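Record Beta2-microglobulin, 97 aa.
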Amino acid sequence: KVSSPKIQVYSHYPGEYGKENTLICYVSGFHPPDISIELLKNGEVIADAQQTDLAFEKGWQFHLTKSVSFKPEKSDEYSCSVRHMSKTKKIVWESNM
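=>
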């Protein structure tokens, strides 16, 4: 039956403050292929995020990408919120900084 999503959150370019960038969430390895993804800014859903079509590879692996433009500042927490089998997991963007 079941396997939990792997959730990876990153930016397209180096995540320096005040610079326009893209926040990306890559979600993979989940069974069943029934999932939802949201990108959050301080715990609030970011609008106009775009999600790839569900991909399916090698007879077993599903993956999805959700992305949105963002401008990271010091005090703001960006995250990816993924609900699978009615359980939500939140993964914070690890800026560094």
